[PDB]
Amino acid sequence: DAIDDKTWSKLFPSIVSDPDRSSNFMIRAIYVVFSAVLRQRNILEKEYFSKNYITENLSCMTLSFKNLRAHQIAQLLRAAGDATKDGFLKEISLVVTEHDGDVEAIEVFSMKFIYFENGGVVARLSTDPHFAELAQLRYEGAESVRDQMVTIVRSVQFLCTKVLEPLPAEFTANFRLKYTNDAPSNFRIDGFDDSSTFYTLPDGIQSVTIGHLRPGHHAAHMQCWSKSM
Amino acid sequence: NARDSPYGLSQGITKKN
C-alpha cells in the first residue's frame, strides 16, 4: 500500500494508512503547501525558501530551515500540524489583509480538516458545506494520496502564477486557525495567541477549490478566496 | 487557563510601500 518513490520519501512518509502516519502526512502537507503559497504569492522573498521536489517532474519551494525567520514560520506550521495528531485542529488559513490586522481579508488560503473515529471510515465530531462531501471521501491508498498532493501543488502554482492578480504593494499576512470542539479549553498552539475574531470575507469575493487530501484517518479540503480572482 | 474562543492568530508578515 506504501509509495515506491525516493523523491516522495524526501518530503513525505511512504506509508499513510495508520493514524500516526496519516497525521504525519498532514503535518508535512501543511508545511509544503503553505510554503508554496508564501513563495508563489511573493509574501516572502526567495531567500526564505529552498528548492525541493515532490516528484521528479514537479518542483516546489519549501521554507528553508537555514533561514532563522523562515525556520520560525516553519515551526508555526509544525505546531499547527501537531494539533492534527489528537484531532484538535479544525482549520488553518493564510489570511491576507490590508492593515494589521483586520478581520476582513483580501486573500485567504484555507485548509479545513475532518477527522475519523476509528478505522478511517466514519467522520468524527469534532464539529458543530464541503464537510458533507469531504466526509463521504474514502481512503483509496497512498498512491491516491500522492496524486492528491501533486494535484494540489500544481494547482497552487498555476493559481498563483497564472490566475490571480499580484497582491497589492502593501499588506499583512498572518496564519489564523480554528480549534475543534473536541479541543480542551486549556489547549492553545504555541505561537498562536487567543482572539475573539477569526477572519471574514467580503460578500462579492470569489472562491476556487484547490484540492483535497485523504490519508488513512484524516481529510483536508483547501480553498482560495481572493479579490485577485 | 480557559479559552474564550476557538480562534488563534499568529505574528503577522507586513510589507510597506
Side-chain angles (χ1 to χ4, degrees), chain A residues 1-3 5-229, chain B:
Chain A
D1 187 26
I3 300 286
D5 188 12
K6 44 174 293 184
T7 304
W8 173 267
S9 292
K10 278 167 177 169
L11 283 186
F12 309 99
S14 311
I15 307 179
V16 289
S17 64
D18 43 321
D20 288 344
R21 284 162 181 172
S22 172
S23 190
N24 273 336
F25 171 78
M26 281 306 189
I27 294 177
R28 306 314 297 165
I30 294 176
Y31 165 72
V32 166
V33 174
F34 274 107
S35 296
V37 174
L38 288 171
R39 174 72 241 111
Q40 231 60 65
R41 280 305 265 165
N42 199 35
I43 298 182
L44 295 175
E45 294 77 69
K46 289 176 178 179
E47 277 69 49
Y48 295 86
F49 308 93
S50 180
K51 179 132 168 291
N52 279 97
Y53 300 92
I54 297 169
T55 65
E56 300 172 343
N57 309 119
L58 188 55
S59 85
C60 60
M61 297 296 294
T62 53
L63 291 159
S64 190
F65 296 90
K66 285 205 169 187
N67 181 306
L68 270 192
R69 184 153 168 265
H71 195 170
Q72 180 173 341
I73 294 174
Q75 287 207 357
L76 272 188
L77 315 176
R78 173 80 179 184
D82 282 324
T84 301
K85 233 82 176 186
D86 287 307
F88 296 151
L89 181 59
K90 183 58 188 63
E91 173 179 347
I92 178 179
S93 293
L94 182 54
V95 175
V96 176
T97 45
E98 277 166 6
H99 314 292
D100 184 19
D102 292 340
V103 176
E104 193 174 22
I106 287 190
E107 175 165 294
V108 178
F109 286 80
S110 168
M111 193 181 305
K112 303 176 185 176
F113 296 88
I114 287 174
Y115 302 89
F116 295 85
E117 270 279 303
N118 282 273
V121 189
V122 202
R124 189 215 283 166
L125 303 101
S126 206
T127 324
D128 299 332
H130 262 277
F131 172 93
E133 303 189 6
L134 189 59
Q136 314 301 331
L137 188 61
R138 290 170 174 182
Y139 174 65
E140 301 176 337
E143 284 289 345
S144 62
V145 175
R146 173 177 168 265
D147 294 337
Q148 283 164 331
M149 177 49 62
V150 169
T151 298
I152 283 181
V153 169
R154 284 219 166 94
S155 299
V156 165
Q157 294 175 334
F158 169 78
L159 173 67
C160 294
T161 57
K162 278 163 182 169
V163 178
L164 292 171
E165 301 268 300
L167 288 170
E170 170 159 13
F171 58 85
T172 295
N174 80 311
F175 287 93
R176 313 188 181 180
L177 50 78
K178 181 170 184 171
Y179 304 103
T180 62
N181 291 358
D182 301 349
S185 308
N186 276 335
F187 186 79
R188 290 179 185 87
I189 304 186
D190 189 24
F192 295 91
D193 305 323
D194 291 16
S195 177
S196 56
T197 60
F198 201 10
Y199 67 97
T200 50
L201 303 173
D203 256 335
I205 206 171
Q206 278 269 332
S207 67
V208 60
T209 288
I210 302 182
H212 309 269
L213 292 160
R214 186 62 168 89
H217 309 262
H218 301 83
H221 169 53
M222 183 166 187
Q223 299 178 251
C224 178
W225 289 268
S226 188
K227 282 165 46 193
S228 310
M229 305 215 73
Chain B
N1 299 340
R3 204 187 56 238
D4 187 275
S5 289
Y7 307 145
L9 313 190
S10 71
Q11 305 281 53
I13 301 172
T14 185
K15 287 199 173 183
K16 293 179 175 174
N17 192 33

